[PDB]
Amino acid sequence: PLAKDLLHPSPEEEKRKHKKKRLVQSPNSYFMDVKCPGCYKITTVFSHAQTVVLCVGCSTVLCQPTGGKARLTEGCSFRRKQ
Amino acid sequence: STASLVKRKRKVMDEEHRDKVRQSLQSALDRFV
Amino acid sequence: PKSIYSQIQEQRIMKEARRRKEVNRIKHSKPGSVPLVSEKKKHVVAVVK
Amino acid sequence: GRMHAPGKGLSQSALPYRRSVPTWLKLTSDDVKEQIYKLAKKGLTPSQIGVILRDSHGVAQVRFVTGNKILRILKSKGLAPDLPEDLYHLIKKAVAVRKHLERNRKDKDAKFRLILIESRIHRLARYYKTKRVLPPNWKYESSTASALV
Amino acid sequence: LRVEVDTFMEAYDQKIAEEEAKAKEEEGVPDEEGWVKVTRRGRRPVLPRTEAASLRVLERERRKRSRKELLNFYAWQHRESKM
RNA sequence: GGAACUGAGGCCAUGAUUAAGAGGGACGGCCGGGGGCAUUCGUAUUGCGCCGCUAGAGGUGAAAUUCUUGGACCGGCGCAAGACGGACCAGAGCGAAAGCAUUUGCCAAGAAUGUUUUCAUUAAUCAAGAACGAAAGUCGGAGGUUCGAAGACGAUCAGAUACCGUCGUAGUUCCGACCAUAAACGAUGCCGACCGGCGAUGCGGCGGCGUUAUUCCCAUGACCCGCCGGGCAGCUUCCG
Ligand SMILES: [Mg+2]
Ligand SMILES: [Mg+2]
Ligand SMILES: [Mg+2]
Ligand SMILES: [Mg+2]
Ligand SMILES: [Mg+2]
Ligand SMILES: [Mg+2]
Ligand SMILES: [Mg+2]
Ligand SMILES: [Mg+2]
Ligand SMILES: [Mg+2]
Ligand SMILES: [Mg+2]
Ligand SMILES: [Mg+2]
Ligand SMILES: [Mg+2]
Ligand SMILES: [Mg+2]
Ligand SMILES: [Mg+2]
Ligand SMILES: [Mg+2]
Ligand SMILES: [Zn+2]
């Protein structure tokens, strides 16, 4: 087999492995800022959302939950946080 | 049991068959037409 | 010896396997999206200087 | 693997190494608590409350923000569940299967599934009695289960 | 009559072609401050911004309210119920 | 109106840390000949009615019992009954096993995947004990097309060449009670850890140069490439 250093994995190796099988566990999910269409209020939405997220200003549907990730509505803009 | 032999032979030949097919591939009304 | 000979055959199989998946990646991607690395300076992580 | 099912899976959550609240979070410890009190009065379980805060309010972990777990926060305020959440849901499932089974005598599979559910109830109840969450006379009965939940 | 139809649709196709080329150029491409717009030209399906789509997703959540909003879970839910 | 001292009450709550590539529960979108109830279609077979035509039809190695001029067999149209679910169907999928295949609706359940949700050791193996358990078979009801142990008839050449034909009892079908056995096989206890490569395959998720359709509702897919999990199976192998 290939020779790997167990103490010093490369960045490409750790991002490919399963999240529980890395040297130190780390999630693949993240939080994002979404900007509503029609009113430009900003809402913080989890990437793998399991509930329908409404804009606080106008109660517009911002996302709909799916199996893996929440699909965003047409016309909104988003940014990753942190 | 020789029933598995024909199955395992067919499974391998199918995989080789995938290889060869991969290699083998390598005026206003005008819009409706 | 058979122990050395077996490892030579196995490591040859793995190396050509990685090459096959690499040419597939560059084919089904943007022409400029794949950096090209020399085999010599591939193994150098960093020079602190 | 699973306690009863043959399959073994690896799907779960992976907590981050860093335990600190991110800077962009503008909610305080007190602000999160009043949100928990509001949703509990609406009739939401502690598992569902944590889901809502994660999806909409950007609270990844209530424990890292306030220093206390959701159930511990509710107990201190006085909004404690009558029955433990995992035990409560198992009893609810057994009632639904038993109601279905009384209209279908020929469903052998449902009869088999009912036995497995009741086994998990007995294991869970035995643990809770040792921890003194339940009185040492609590018993699960099929007729009593409907009134229990 | 035939000339006007041909002239009209020739101009219409040219306008349509320009819009597609501009949309392809803008697809992705975070702007200043780093906002990325969500369109149908990506590989992930997106929720349409139509009245029918919003009513469908909200109705699905409303049918689930019975299961997720409980009436006898908490101790207080029993005591003012007995009143 | 201010301050400083001080005194007893009433409710609720009373806990070592973390969050196991241990386990349970919840949540999300999917997925499957998994199960139960109802509904529905398809030829075929059998029986019956009518029409046309006229000596044979059936069966075998050869025949013979049997049916036929009061019309058999064959051709057409229509009606009824009971079973069955071809081709598509794969070493694919589901279930603890036994097992599971026409459309649509309903009821409850489930694996895997996704999760920065929740509890916090709740776990493993197990005499005793309990649920299920192909086919055949027993008891009581309802039906009976096809097939068919038993039985009665007709024959019984080749031959180490060796078990036919016509009719067809119990059964085969359904609803309840029993019975608890199979080459019920990998002829092969369970849980945990460690220990080589290479591709396909089913499901779920993630990323993607390009093709191909497009969304009132219904729906956001089909193909190609890389990666990650748990499955069904393979090709090759070092040490042991
Ligand atoms: Mg899971
Ligand atoms: Mg994709
Ligand atoms: Mg854990
Ligand atoms: Mg389904
Ligand atoms: Mg199904
Ligand atoms: Mg006649
Ligand atoms: Mg006829
Ligand atoms: Mg069919
Ligand atoms: Mg039987
Ligand atoms: Mg029988
Ligand atoms: Mg009988
Ligand atoms: Mg068998
Ligand atoms: Mg055995
Ligand atoms: Mg599957
Ligand atoms: Mg897939
Ligand atoms: Zn808005």
- Residue spans of the domains in chain A: they are 1-82
Nearest alpha carbon to residue D124 among D95, D88, D96 = D88
User: E65: which chain A residues are within 8 Å (Cβ-Cβ)?
Assistant: none
The tally of CA atoms less than 13 A away on the side-chain side of residue C27 is: 7
Q: How far apart are CA D92 and CA E68, in angstroms?
A: 13
Cβ-contact D41, E75 below 8 angstroms: no
Q: Name the A residues in 20-79 with CB < 8 Å from any E CB.
A: 35, 37, 51-52, 60-61, 63-64, 69, 71-79
Cβ-contact A78, A34 below 8 angstroms: yes
Per residue in E48-58, is it b (16+ CB within 10 Å) or e — as a string? ebeeeebeebe
* All residues at 6 or more sequence positions from E8 whose CB lies less than 8 Å from its CB, including other chains: none
Helix (H) or strand (E) holding C12: helix C2-27
Q: What is the DSSP code (8-state) at residue D132?
A: T
Nearest alpha carbon to residue E39 among A76, A49, A62, A46 = A76
Asked if the C-beta of E47 comes within 8 angstroms of chain A's C-beta atoms, the answer is: yes
Q: What is the DSSP code (8-state) at residue E47?
A: B
Alpha helices in D1-149 (DSSP H): 29-41, 46-56, 62-66, 70-77, 85-101, 108-130, 142-148
Q: How far apart are CA D42 and CA D47, in angstroms?
A: 14
Asked if the C-beta of E16 comes within 8 angstroms of chain B's C-beta atoms, the answer is: no
Using what technique was this structure determined?
cryo-EM
- The string of DSSP codes covering A29-43 is --EEEEE-SSS--EE
Cβ-contact A79, E34 below 8 angstroms: yes
Domains of chain D: 26-80 (no CATH), 81-149 (1.10.287.10)
Which residue reads 């010896």 in tokens?
C1
Backbone phi, psi, residue D148, to 5° = -65, -45
Report residue A48 as tokens: 């793998």
Which residue reads 């309210």 in tokens?
E65
Per residue in C21-40, is it b (16+ CB within 10 Å) or e — as a string? eeeeeeeeeeeeeeeeeeee
Helix (H) or strand (E) holding E62: helix E51-63
Q: Which class is domain A1-82?
A: mainly beta
C-alpha distances out from residue A16 to A9, A12, C16, D12, D143, Å: 11, 6, 20, 17, 53
How far does the CA of D105 sit from the C1' of F121, in Å? 39
Helix (H, G, I), strand (E, B) or coil at A71: strand
User: Using N-to-C axis directions, what is the helix angle for D29-41 and D70-77, rounded to 10°?
Assistant: 70
Of how many residues is chain B composed?
33
Cβ-contact D70, D50 below 8 angstroms: yes
Q: What is the DSSP code (8-state) at residue D57?
A: S
Helix (H, G, I), strand (E, B) or coil at A4: coil
Q: How far apart are CA E22 and CA A66, in angstroms?
A: 30
Q: Which residues pair with E36 in a beta bridge?
A: A78
